[PDB]
Design an enzyme around this catalytic site. Sequence first.
Site, PDB file in Angstrom:
ATOM      1  N   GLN A 159       0.738  -1.243   0.000  1.00 43.47           N
ATOM      2  CA  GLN A 159       0.000   0.000   0.000  1.00 43.47           C
ATOM      3  C   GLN A 159       0.781   1.316   0.000  1.00 43.47           C
ATOM      4  O   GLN A 159       0.495   2.225  -0.790  1.00 43.47           O
ATOM      5  CB  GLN A 159      -0.950  -0.048   1.161  1.00 43.47           C
ATOM      6  N   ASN A 215       9.416   8.229   8.310  1.00 43.47           N
ATOM      7  CA  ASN A 215       8.348   9.213   8.184  1.00 43.47           C
ATOM      8  C   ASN A 215       8.497  10.304   9.169  1.00 43.47           C
ATOM      9  O   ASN A 215       8.413  11.455   8.816  1.00 43.47           O
ATOM     10  CB  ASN A 215       6.987   8.580   8.356  1.00 43.47           C
ATOM     11  N   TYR A 257      -0.927  12.049   3.682  1.00 37.38           N
ATOM     12  CA  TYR A 257      -0.184  10.941   3.093  1.00 37.38           C
ATOM     13  C   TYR A 257       0.397  11.383   1.777  1.00 37.38           C
ATOM     14  O   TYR A 257       1.626  11.345   1.575  1.00 37.38           O
ATOM     15  CB  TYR A 257      -1.053   9.689   2.908  1.00 37.38           C
ATOM     16  N   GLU A 286      26.717   0.491  -9.977  1.00 39.81           N
ATOM     17  CA  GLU A 286      27.446   1.676  -9.488  1.00 39.81           C
ATOM     18  C   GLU A 286      26.949   2.133  -8.113  1.00 39.81           C
ATOM     19  O   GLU A 286      27.542   3.040  -7.482  1.00 39.81           O
ATOM     20  CB  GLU A 286      27.356   2.828 -10.488  1.00 39.81           C
TER      21      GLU A 286
END
Lengths: 134, 433, 430, 426, 422
Positions: free
Chosen positions: B10, B200, B218, B248
């Site tokens: 989600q 977050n 959100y 790399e």
Amino acid sequence: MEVIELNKCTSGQSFEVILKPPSFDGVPEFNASLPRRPSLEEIQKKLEAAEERRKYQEAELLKHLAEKREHEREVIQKAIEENNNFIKMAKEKLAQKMESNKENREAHLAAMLERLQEKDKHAEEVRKNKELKE
Amino acid sequence: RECISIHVGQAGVQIGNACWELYCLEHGIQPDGQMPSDGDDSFNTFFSETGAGKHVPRAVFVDLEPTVIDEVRTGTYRQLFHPEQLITGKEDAANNYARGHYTIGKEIIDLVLDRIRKLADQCTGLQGFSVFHSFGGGTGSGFTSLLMERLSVDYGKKSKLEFSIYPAPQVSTAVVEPYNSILTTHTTLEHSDCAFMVDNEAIYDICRRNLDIERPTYTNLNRLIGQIVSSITASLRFDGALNVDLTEFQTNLVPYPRIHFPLATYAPVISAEKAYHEQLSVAEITNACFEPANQMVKCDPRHGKYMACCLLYRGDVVPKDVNAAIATIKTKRTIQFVDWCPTGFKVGINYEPPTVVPGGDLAKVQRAVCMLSNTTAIAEAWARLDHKFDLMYAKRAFVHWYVGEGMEEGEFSEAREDMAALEKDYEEVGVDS
Amino acid sequence: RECISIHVGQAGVQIGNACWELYCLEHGIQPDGQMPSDSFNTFFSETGAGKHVPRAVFVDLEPTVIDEVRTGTYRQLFHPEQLITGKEDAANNYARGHYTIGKEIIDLVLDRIRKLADQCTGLQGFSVFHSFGGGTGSGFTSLLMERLSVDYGKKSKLEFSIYPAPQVSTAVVEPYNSILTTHTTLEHSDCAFMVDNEAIYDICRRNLDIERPTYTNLNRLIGQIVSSITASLRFDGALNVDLTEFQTNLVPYPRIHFPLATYAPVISAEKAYHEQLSVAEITNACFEPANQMVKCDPRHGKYMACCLLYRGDVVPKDVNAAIATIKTKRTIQFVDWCPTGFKVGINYEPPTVVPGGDLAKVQRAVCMLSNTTAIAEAWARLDHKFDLMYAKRAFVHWYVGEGMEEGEFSEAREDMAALEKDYEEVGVDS
Amino acid sequence: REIVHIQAGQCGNQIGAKFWEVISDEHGIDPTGSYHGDSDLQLERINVYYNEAAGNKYVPRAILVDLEPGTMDSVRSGPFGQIFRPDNFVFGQSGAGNNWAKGHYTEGAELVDSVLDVVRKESESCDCLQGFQLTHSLGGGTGSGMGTLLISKIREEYPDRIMNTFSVVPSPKVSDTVVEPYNATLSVHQLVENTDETYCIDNEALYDICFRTLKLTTPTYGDLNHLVSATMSGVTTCLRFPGQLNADLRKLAVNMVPFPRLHFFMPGFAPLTSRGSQQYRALTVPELTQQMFDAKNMMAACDPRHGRYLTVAAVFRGRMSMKEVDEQMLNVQNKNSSYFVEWIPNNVKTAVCDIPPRGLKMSATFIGNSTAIQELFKRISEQFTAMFRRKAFLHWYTGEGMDEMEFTEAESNMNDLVSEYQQYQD
Amino acid sequence: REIVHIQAGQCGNQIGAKFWEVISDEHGIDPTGSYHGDSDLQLERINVYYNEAAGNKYVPRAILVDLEPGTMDSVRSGPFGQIFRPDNFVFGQSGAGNNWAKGHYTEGAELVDSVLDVVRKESESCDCLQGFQLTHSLGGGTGSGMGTLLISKIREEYPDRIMNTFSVVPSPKVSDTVVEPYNATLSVHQLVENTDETYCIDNEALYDICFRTLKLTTPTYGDLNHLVSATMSGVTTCLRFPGQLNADLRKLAVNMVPFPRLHFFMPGFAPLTQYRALTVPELTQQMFDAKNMMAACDPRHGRYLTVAAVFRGRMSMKEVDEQMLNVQNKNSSYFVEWIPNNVKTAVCDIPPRGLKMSATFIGNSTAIQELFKRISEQFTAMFRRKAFLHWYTGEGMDEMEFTEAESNMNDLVSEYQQYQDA
Ligand SMILES: Nc1nc2c(ncn2[C@@H]2O[C@H](COP(=O)(O)OP(=O)(O)OP(=O)(O)O)[C@@H](O)[C@H]2O)c(=O)[nH]1
Ligand SMILES: Nc1nc2c(ncn2[C@@H]2O[C@H](COP(=O)(O)OP(=O)(O)OP(=O)(O)O)[C@@H](O)[C@H]2O)c(=O)[nH]1
Ligand SMILES: COc1cc([C@@H]2c3cc4c(cc3[C@H](O)[C@H]3COC(=O)C23)OCO4)cc(OC)c1OC
Ligand SMILES: COc1cc([C@@H]2c3cc4c(cc3[C@H](O)[C@H]3COC(=O)[C@H]23)OCO4)cc(OC)c1OC
Ligand SMILES: Nc1nc2c(ncn2[C@@H]2O[C@H](COP(=O)(O)OP(=O)(O)O)[C@@H](O)[C@H]2O)c(=O)[nH]1
Ligand SMILES: Nc1nc2c(ncn2[C@@H]2O[C@H](COP(=O)(O)OP(=O)(O)O)[C@@H](O)[C@H]2O)c(=O)[nH]1
Ligand SMILES: [Mg+2]
């Protein structure tokens, strides 16, 4: 100070400011491990033995339950069994007490009637004693 | 050469959805059609040019309920994928790793694993996958790991890059989150080549000092990650040295097998309304680069040492400056470079100015930076997590919900006991003799 | 659902006759016809297209009593079929009923009653009214009850027993007769309402102020109690009432326990205008040794379940405040192991009394059914009577004569011995 | 139920006749005719004592038996003569008797069937039978010997239904013969064995009341009988009359007798005598009871005192109040509590009835099972025990064909009875 | 997913009816009719609670169960009577019950299948099933005994899917019968073993709130029920409503219960029984109160395991997130530290009843034990000298069966009590 130019392109460019070199002679070995786990498609059979546990728990607590289920069927049954089982007793010990009644009075009767019957084979067997004195 | 985005889970999905958005904006893609605007590829890094109009990404979305995925099939961008790249599992969200990686995952793993090969079947020499997923949380804690297991079996060489979202007490979901990250990140860690933690409580926290919203939506958060992610990639969607091709990415960032999770830091985040004050000192963007508050994983590398360092610039920027600005960064610094690793400073200016989303929150930036560093201090966050876990497990907390779906308790002791190794691994690199 | 009154036994009959009377007055029934002015179906079946008719049986073994029912109004209210008369030989001994003369009529009765519960979509039980002592209702009652249980296993049964009082009583042999019936009977009854005349009579002295007590007089008073007793299930049966809850709520143990009854404001006409009786007083006077039903007192014994059936203009808020205050001015005496019973049954419907009557317009009345150890006291005074006669075969041979074993006697009284210990046994535990 | 009545033996006959005509005019019956008392009660139970034939008329369920014409034709011509149905008379023709032997064996069995059969046709006619009451003389033959047979043949054809008698136990004072003991003691043996209840009217009290307390100098057989008559009314009352109880005779057995041995009740009456006064009325009810529970007022030569009471039943008659009566009765069983078996809890019940006998506005009467009665038996035995001793007049039955041992075997039945009553003073 | 609902036993029924009609007019449903609230939200999830048949109409996925007519026909004639589908009523005819035994064995199994089956045709009809919520009375028979059987037969046909209940645990004050303990303790045993989550509404708090803090002198069964009804609205909110979370009942298990032993939540409501000015401090304060819980229980005497609270109205998570925190500090003590984030909070823009501001509370707290210990206490003292028992002995049960249920309870207590640890 010096930089060190690493590529040049249509839309960019790179380099390096190395600023003072390390304090080096190579060093460590921190889980840069000599036996370290290249892994294996065979361990789909590790995904299975986890799901054979679920199939388990379900099937043995649907067992610990058709177990319960089929005790119920036997309680409601031991109550058709409790009842049915006391009709058949105080229903029958009813008429049993009633043969003890028609039978006992059948006696204290035809045995009361018995006295008053040889009071009578005496009235008439000592009237055939009327034939005595006279 | 080429590059498949997988967004399981989600969070991953929405994040995807909102950085795919930014991809487009940047390359010139009207949702449906072509860049029709007045050498041979360059933007093909990610997309395959199908039909004779269409541009279409190399993408896969997986979630185990519809809900989220549908919204993709509702609002513009709904034209930009194939319905086929959009796997929805209609069945039983989850909320435990046990669910995904085992119970409900088993179900869809095949259909997914399928499509994605089907996708790398177009592709003259794929490179690897960048896979976006939530750290905690049912199916992207759970399923993510299952995906990754199989992936490595099928693409041995081809490397893999996780963008993980590390969950934040306030803007989070469920109690069981710790168990879930710790669970995934254990299994997951042996199969990923480098991994981008995003916390977050750092993004949210940025959207406070910088975007000044009491709010964080959100979506809000996402466009922000979306941005970093752009800067993170895109070295390889535009091709201009400082890393292009996944190899790399370990080469320049992880010195040791153990997946090390680089620390991320975007440059000038600044709100519209305030969008005309600009001209940010090619020095400041750098100086503010080395800023505990302007990070990505809540912690600080004043406490830890550095073991590889990496600036990705984007904008009107000739190096002669960057250099002078590195110089001045170092002498006003607790710089802290560890022992045995001369001084990383691979610099990737990238010319291309950094378009932001037009409704947006951030605005016209004429120069931005990115700074990917592997530092011991990134551990601090691993500790915060473990300790949560540690203290729940100390009472079988929710355990039996996983045991229930069919796990061994012993996955637990044996998983947390891997963090134990890593947490030592980490501090171990620290300041040598 | 439904409910068959059985009145065996001359007392039971008259009592029946005089609470069936009260039933009508309360539900609106002109003897013959309709309430022309379900829920009341609790007892009655609405036959024909006019007349309302009870679910009733009367049995006695002489006519005499029953005939008076087929004489004066109410004579239209039954079927002649619900009215079994046994034309033959009253009795005056249990041995008579339960064996000799009973044997004869048990069938015809056992019949009609099924015939009656054949109308009835799911009967509930029978309440059976009978005299404690006295030939055919000491005797036959028990016979009825045996058979009933055989034919209606589940379906529960409720006896209303009249416990006989030295002054307003009949025959010497009364003790023998109760102790006899109540032994046999007790195995088959699910709960049983003793009513002792020496308490009714005694009430009709302090309360009705008659130097007189007429049989009829007593009856209308029991009649009343009985109304309040039932009627939870006749009136408030706009839906969900069902015995097993008069039940469930009163007897804690197999042994048939005979709750104690207590009507509230008994008060004469002439005095009917003084009214307004404290919703508190009717309760306080409820807990009154003198105002009881079975001559005794629960000051001496403990309580093991308690129950108030009000009837009139009454919101609980009172009753409750009136319980509270009943608690603290009380030798309350709640036994050990049965947290405090106090099922409260307000019944809205005001309590119509018979118009000629003795009692008058009551705006609020109460009932109080309590099972207490003390109800034993009366079992003792009875036993002892028996005990002391049997000590010399007193009249025994009159029962033996009709065909009983002496051993029914020792083996009966010896059941009371059990019960009497049973009772005291519940008392104040560790 | 419903009862029929046997009235046998010259005395038993006058007793029953003087009975019949007293009760009959209690219910308002004319020599034949029907009702003539615009008071309603009377008839509910007229039932129990009168089968009723064609048209109006009322006819008693009564059967008349004797072993010589005369004494019936004294009812037939005389009182309520025209009442009894004619094929209900059973004249014996025959030798009288005046020895039990005669009436229980010889000229006795001679008739039996003729009577035994008319009794059947009356009891088989009646709806649900109660039993029978027989009135007879316990001393002297026809009805001492006949009646005692009669019963020992009734009982046998009717063992369900119950058995009642009024027996007149004879004296040495206004008795006729010095055989009396023999007869009484022979009947009294029979009696004990096949009556469920018997009333003893001993002529001794019957005389004693007449002269010792009733001014009367030469006691008639009549001014004497009217006594027993009036007693018999007031003893049957309840089974004849109102709503209260009604008394199935049965009911009056298993309420009066604790013991199989039929225990005979001494009755007792309230106010008494011929005609010439003591219709004072003012017989207050204390004054009634007091006079009723009196030695000098019992129907058997016997003064309760020398015998406790087993069970007792007393009924009042007139316009008074159970208000005073239930009150009065109690102050008896206290100011007398001593003599009154405690082992029979309620041994004394009391009835009232709104319709007076004879003259009297207030009048009660008394039924009494008392161990006291033994006094009376011990006496007949005493005369007998002393006579049959040196086998006096006996050879007078030896002849009609009896056994010596039969006397002793009846004697020591008696002499037991005594010694059982005496045993129950425990 | 998507859920169906079993509403059995005269209380359980009124509870569910007074429920259905409260929630229904939250979503804007007419006695039959469809939508009548030109506000859009409502329907996304109308889904989870209503299967929808021909034309407009909306019909709840609800099943009605009782062992005596009466109490359904009280819904049928009455409130939102015309709503429920007719072959969804399952009248018992039968003896009442009012002994567990009756409703779990005799007259119980009598019906089972009739219900069990209609439940099947409704759950097999529904798209992907969630599980079931059953509303029933834990004391007194039909639905203490029936419902407990019902589940122990649901679970079994539906072991994947999850198990919910609103159980009304009875009091000694405004209870009916002196048997209650027995019934409760019998069900409560059952409960513990086959529900994944149960809510306890103890009538004792339900009364105590009604009179002790709501002026009302004689508590109706109605002016009493509206309480429980309202609570149930605000407890389901999330799985009925908007975008934020949506709560798979599942999700609401493995988040609320650390321990298999199903731990029942005491609920708690906000404003009860129209100042509006319920500032939000003022809301929280009143919500986390002793004198405001849905079970006779005062958290204090029990720590909180995990707690979930949803707010309802137009306010701000600006103040709420801020307010919630100042609770878990001025209360920090009682709040298991060994479950890091034990308290989450949701907002939703559409008020219940009257109320412009209203919240509600879901509470797994060791405190709840207080209530169990009590039923035990009446029971333990009753079944002691085997009181009224011979009343079940008769419908065919075992003596040991009580003890075996008694010492299940008396365990539960001694586990809750055990988890006041760290
Ligand atoms: N940064 C960010 N985090 C998100 C977003 N959506 C969910 N999360 C976080 O991801 C963690 C849980 O992952 P989820 O995506 O919610 O759950 P899932 O297992 O992947 O999918 P479900 O089956 O729907 O539960 C929580 O800590 C949330 O804070 C998002 O859009 N942005
Ligand atoms: N309370 C009350 N008791 C009565 C009534 N009628 C009789 N009794 C009592 O009942 C007891 C005897 O019962 P009965 O009904 O008289 O006799 P039975 O055997 O039922 O019927 P019978 O064959 O007529 O004797 C006695 O103690 C009387 O006091 C009455 O109407 N009310
Ligand atoms: C027909 O004769 C009578 C018979 C009865 C007897 C009687 C006799 C009793 C007794 C009671 C009773 C009982 O109340 C009666 C019911 O039926 C009767 O025959 C009774 O206690 C001690 O002795 C009672 C009578 O009234 C006193 C009576 O009057 C003549
Ligand atoms: C359907 O009911 C609800 C369920 C959830 C639970 C819940 C419960 C928690 C919790 C978290 C969560 C989690 O965020 C949710 C996601 O889905 C849910 O059901 C949750 O931390 C402690 O307790 C949370 C709810 O909001 C408070 C809720 O509202 C009624
Ligand atoms: N009181 C009463 N007793 C009588 C009467 N006639 C005779 N007796 C007594 O009864 C005894 C004889 O009875 P009786 O009738 O003459 O003999 P039977 O007719 O041949 O049986 C005598 O001792 C008398 O005392 C009578 O008129 N009334
Ligand atoms: N609060 C709530 N509880 C009730 C209600 N009705 C009964 N109860 C309670 O639940 C118990 C009995 O449940 P009930 O529904 O009457 O039994 P059943 O329907 O036969 O299962 C009693 O102790 C009551 O306290 C109701 O209206 N609401
Ligand atoms: Mg009788």
